[PDB]
Enzyme design. Structure first.
Site, PDB file in Angstrom:
ATOM      1  N   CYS A  29       0.826  -1.202   0.000  1.00  0.00           N
ATOM      2  CA  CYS A  29       0.000   0.000   0.000  1.00  0.00           C
ATOM      3  C   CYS A  29       0.853   1.242   0.000  1.00  0.00           C
ATOM      4  O   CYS A  29       0.528   2.231  -0.657  1.00  0.00           O
ATOM      5  CB  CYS A  29      -0.916  -0.016   1.220  1.00  0.00           C
ATOM      6  SG  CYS A  29      -2.026  -1.438   1.197  1.00  0.00           S
ATOM      7  N   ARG A  41      -9.864  -4.224  -1.231  1.00  0.00           N
ATOM      8  CA  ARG A  41      -9.051  -3.796  -2.357  1.00  0.00           C
ATOM      9  C   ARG A  41      -9.977  -3.486  -3.520  1.00  0.00           C
ATOM     10  O   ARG A  41     -11.030  -4.116  -3.671  1.00  0.00           O
ATOM     11  CB  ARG A  41      -8.076  -4.901  -2.771  1.00  0.00           C
ATOM     12  CG  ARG A  41      -6.705  -4.837  -2.119  1.00  0.00           C
ATOM     13  CD  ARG A  41      -5.996  -3.546  -2.478  1.00  0.00           C
ATOM     14  NE  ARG A  41      -4.618  -3.518  -2.006  1.00  0.00           N
ATOM     15  CZ  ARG A  41      -3.549  -3.582  -2.793  1.00  0.00           C
ATOM     16  NH1 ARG A  41      -3.685  -3.677  -4.111  1.00  0.00           N
ATOM     17  NH2 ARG A  41      -2.337  -3.549  -2.257  1.00  0.00           N
TER      18      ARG A  41
END
Lengths: 238, 241, 237, 238, 236, 237, 242, 233
Positions: free
Chosen positions: E47, E119
């Site tokens: 991330c 996600r």
């Protein structure tokens, strides 16, 4: 599903052997109390002995502004023939009306229903409110003099703003004394005790004798008669 | 939603100031009748008089085989302090147990309670040795019960079962038949015809037959209850303190 | 279901030994906080000690504009008779009202329901909003001085616009100091560090000392009293 | 929809920065009490002070057979970074595990859900039964010494079969004494009074002093620490 | 139960490290497109690399009139601390807001929910309409340059009224050509073949080259940047 | 719609190669499969993509990946559509296409209007959906990007590594692969004490375990995607 | 779940290779009858033969004020390519519109699809009059091609029955009993039947069996021309000519 | 019901007695055509009865048994047949189901009574193969029903699909269509073999039906087109 003390008497149209009437309105409009009493079936001994006993005390009820009304699970034609039998074979005329209840519609509405379960007494005040309910079994005759004591004591409690003690007017503790409703706050209880206007055991137990000698003796009169051994039974003079 | 007359007393386990007991089993086990009487609250004046009325007539109830048990919407601790007060100030011990009913579960179960009520939480349950509800009486909170009538009920009802008789109005002082007891009426014509042919009973019709099978002790026992009810008691209990 | 923190106190009408009152309306109108503490039964020893404890700290509550109100699953008649026993045998008067809750309606409405479950402290602000809930068991008596510390600190937090640290005013890190409510944006975080206004350990840990000396020592006073062995008890005299 | 006091702590598996443990099994297996305390978020000032306070009292809880476990609605990586900051800056290490509860699953299962609502202390015994619940708001730091007192009193109550007075061991009426659980029958009350084995005010108010000098002094030590101003504050030493 | 392509982005009030904003309103008000990208947790390596990649391409997005907004299942204070670590240890400032989603309210409302599941990229136009959604696994970082190509293709497609071939502007059949939307009637199909105004393969396959040189080159730049090994790594 | 991590729904589908079970047909071969869906036959954008997929069929075979199309049209339309591409474009389409009249297969996969019937489902050899992509109908897919996803995933699975953004051209760590972060405090300690990885933090650790082949093969795909095509296919016909 | 005879044709918008139209509004507002015929798929042999058969009977249908419209579970693009193949390979232009029914939405509403994975059941013929009312329904299986000349007989005989206020006998106009005669709708009351026998205006077998011959010489021979075309082997086949 | 569905299991009362459907015919290895009628003593329905009966042997030749359905009493059915035989002079051999209450009609989706029409064509397996719904104001064309059952029998036996207007198709004439290939390899192999004439891989045919079979089908359509010599009236 039986009604409760405090609830208004279920609004209903009924057919009696005197005619069709609306309850409790027929008696509320007149400003009268009324006592409703149910009966399993017509031409039955226990129920008959109750009719007679009620009729022998008819003027006592009228004197107390109480109308009488019966309930039975039989036709209106059976009801009339039944009253006709009592007046002829016992010698006592039955003045008050009897609700004709085929289908047991009225008894179902009151929660009295088997047909054997269809008993009990409803004591309704002049406002149309149920004040006392008795439920004797069909194998036991009621004490109409206690019903008389109930309407009497209840009316005195209402008009004098008093609660009525056990076995009044022959209470073990305070006799003919009437109970002043207990205080529901600290201040009221402290105020009651300081004033010294009431005979008391404790702040929550205060009584006096506000009732007239006439009303006390009228109440004891019912119990006197109930305990009394009758002179000449009706089966003899008939 | 009350239990009707003739219906069995609801199976339940209650907390009393005498311990925890199961109704109606506890009394059925002993082969005793029991009278259950309900009350709105502890430390209330009308309910106190009724307690003393029952307690003064406790010996009468036991001679018939009738136990007593109270019901009130208050904690068990409150019940005992209430029973302590009556003994101290009135000078009369309360021998019977009282059901501690906070939450009003058993009152709600028996059909004595909507909220804000408790006022309605009264009524008398007369229950026989077989656990069957026989008589229910509903006096308001502003009205003290006539306890001698309860004694009259059980005595008449126990005589009714024993002697197989229906009990007339005002017994033992019926206006028609006095202390006489009613024979349960014929349900068939062949029984009605036979009854009339038998000529064993005093009759007014085929459906109205009676005799006098009760003993002079049984009858005088019933009059003593009514006599006591009618008599103004010599010397009160407030003055004795 | 218990009415959680942030939620307004459930609108209800209750019967007490002082009269009939609406909650939280009765105290909101007076601009008063109130502490509602519940009990399973009357004439019970643990509850009696607490009743005495509250009454001995009654002026401390009044000074903070906090009213007290009891709850017990018994009739009003028992309540007053119980208070009479305390005033005679312990010699301590009980000034606050107690809710008479037969059938247990209020307790069920508050979600305190067995009867054994019926125990809880509800601290409600002047706006009528629940701020703290304390659930103690029946076999344990509440530390009433902590309840005092809660309102005092919570009232300070409101007026001073601060968060109150653990163990206040005896916090191991900042002690008597009070915490500034942390930034929730990047802009707030920078402007906090560029102000040089507060003492800091990080952008999210800033604090100062805005409470007066009276406020601090008043709060420590509660904790000391809970810690001090009482000079001769009340069962003796 | 919260778990009531006296109920068994809800069966669940949780993720801590120590690993995965089954609640309350993990602590019951050891015969240990545990205190679960929930928090709104990581990197929050009040919660940090709360962690430090629990940290400085770690060995006290161990001596009482009590383990600590936190709950915060953030990830595990955030948890470890949070703990790391506290050691680096405040100097105090945080030994107890913290449940990582994103999605708020555990918080919801315990009825704590805004996220500001996520506060509360669960004191749970060696049998996995909830014994006390404390709900301080997010703007108000808890008094951790009170939690120590609760457990202590609770542990002495269970073992000695006694109830604990208010403000114990500094109760106004009976002091460091402990309440004998009240009688529930008429016969129990009479037998208690005729025996005369306890100091008394009434049949329902009997007590004695069965707690040892050390147990009492350990409880007052918690209350004195909470009362006393700390010499040397942790912030000063950079 | 995710939102669909062509469906308007679900109305919601969300909490970010820049403040409270309403989606998609906040961007529709500015006449801007926005790319929303979701993340399982804070202080996570993949991330973080994604954050930096968006930040290095921030000028490229704004010039296309596209704002960037992140989503992570963590508090606002974690987000700020996370952004702090990045500017300090990577030396890249993360400019765009991140939605703080504790309880996974937004994640659930967008149908991203396990938490590992959180996600997904949402490309939403200035009308507030969802145009493209990519769902990469958490172990796999995204190709941020492809999001830029997607947008660029859609913006040209909307304005030139054309469809975009595979691998545009480097399509093996038509190159940097663009598809004329196919006929849907026989009269349309006849008039298309009669007109001869388009390079054609069939009546349903017509194209021309209406995109400017600078548009096509800007599109190859994104793929050129993605393709080349970066000179000078940031960790160094 | 099915999600990432979940197993691809059990179903029987009719293709232009025959009837197959999904995902059984490809799991039983120990093969990955990419399912791409299209609104209708004889549509332009879909045709360009079919071609793009076919021209990379060797790259998918080399990774143990099978291609499978989906279109809401009959099998007979499918085969005639393949004929057109083969005749007019001179490229064979070797992979099967699901015949989806009624749109039952699309509906189950949540692809449903018929315009919304677009989506790339990358499913591993275990029948588990690993990636999903949803492009609009007016946009042609970047097929080389699908190739990068499968390579990185296969690399990530075998080496127990996470793949960073833009890989193998990441701006921070290049072709480096990320070690999965520690979840406990002890795992975080032992990581920074070992010194077996390059790191920015205990949660940010990486190494370079991918062979020079695996790296360059992945960079290939992106270079080809970026390359201006020499000689166009429409001109060849 | 299918609609029945007498019921109005369900209201719906369809997409064709001619554009978007409302049914039956589009044809009702023209005063045109329409025959909707449904097929499982494009590029299928039996359906192609049927398309050809309708197409060469197009002028006959247009002469009767009847429009044709196909329904197939395939895209509108597959439809145009399918029409193109026919015009190029068979040399016959398909003039009528075909409904494109991906998702089977239209077919499901018409009851051509009930359960799952069928499309095979999509083989219905709906004959709808100018009032938008379903008059005749035909359900041939997919392995059987329809007899298009029968559909012409139906609409012709029905138009005759509506106008002349008559019923059409079996095998008309070659009925074994009454030949090219048309049936007078039977009396429904007691004295209607009595008046019918008292009138003597109709040839009769019973009060409920009365007929005359009001149909024109052209109308009868046109109907026979439909059946002759059906009966006669065609000179020069279309596969031969291609 | 639909095509492909087995005929619903029902027990019906007819004027020849009670029979089980479709079992009575399945167990005989016989096809059956069930044609339904709104009401008895009705002209259109009568002309159909005659048309079916004069073609009785043709159905017997095809192994097809016939059966009628009417919303009337069984006693009415017999009186109705009695009228036809006495006045028209044509005996009705097939059974007619008595359906008062319209129960059978309801189960068959034919329910107004006006809607109570339709021909169900059922094979020797008990499977519905064709359904024809004519309106009550228009009489059917029995020769087409004959053509249908005949084509289906040849289609089954030869494993072929039947073109439109067969045996008089405009494209392939009396040609019979091979069921189209479903795979690419099947389509590939079909064109390579050369065993069928073709327009495309999906359009292949041949002439496997005998001259008799082809001429027997054309007989039906010829008869329908022939102007009758001597009308029965």
């Amino acid at each position: 599903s039986i009604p409760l003390i405090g609830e208004r008497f279920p609004e209903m149209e009924v057919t009696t052997d005197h005619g069709v009437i609306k309850l409790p309105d027929h008696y509320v409009s007149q400003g009268k109390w009324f006592v409703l009493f149910s009966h399993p079936a017509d031409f039955t001994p226990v129920c008959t002995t109750e009719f007679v006993s009620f009729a022998r005390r008819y003027e006592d009820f009228q004197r107390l502004g109480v109308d009488l009304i019966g309930l039975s699970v039989d036709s209106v034609f059976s009801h009339i023939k039944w009253k006709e039998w009592i007046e002829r074979h016992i010698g006592v005329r039955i003045p008050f009306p009897i609700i004709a209840d085929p289908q047991g519609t009225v008894a179902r509405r009151l929660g009295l229903l088997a047909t054997h379960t269809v008993r009990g007494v409803f004591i309704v005040d002049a406002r149309g409110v149920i004040r006392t309910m008795l439920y004797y079994p069909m194998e036991l005759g009621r004490l109409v003099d206690e019903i008389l004591r109930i309407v009497k004591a209840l009316k005195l409690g209402d008009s004098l703003k008093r609660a009525v003690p056990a076995d009044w007017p022959n209470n073990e503790i305070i006799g003919e004394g009437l109970i002043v409703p207990p205080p529901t706050t600290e201040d009221q209880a402290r105020a009651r005790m300081e004033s010294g206007q009431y005979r008391s055991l404790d702040w929550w137990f205060c009584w006096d004798t506000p009732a007239s000698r006439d009303d006390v003796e009228e109440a004891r009169r019912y119990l006197r008669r109930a305990a009394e051994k009758p002179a000449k039974l009706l089966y003899e003079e008939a």
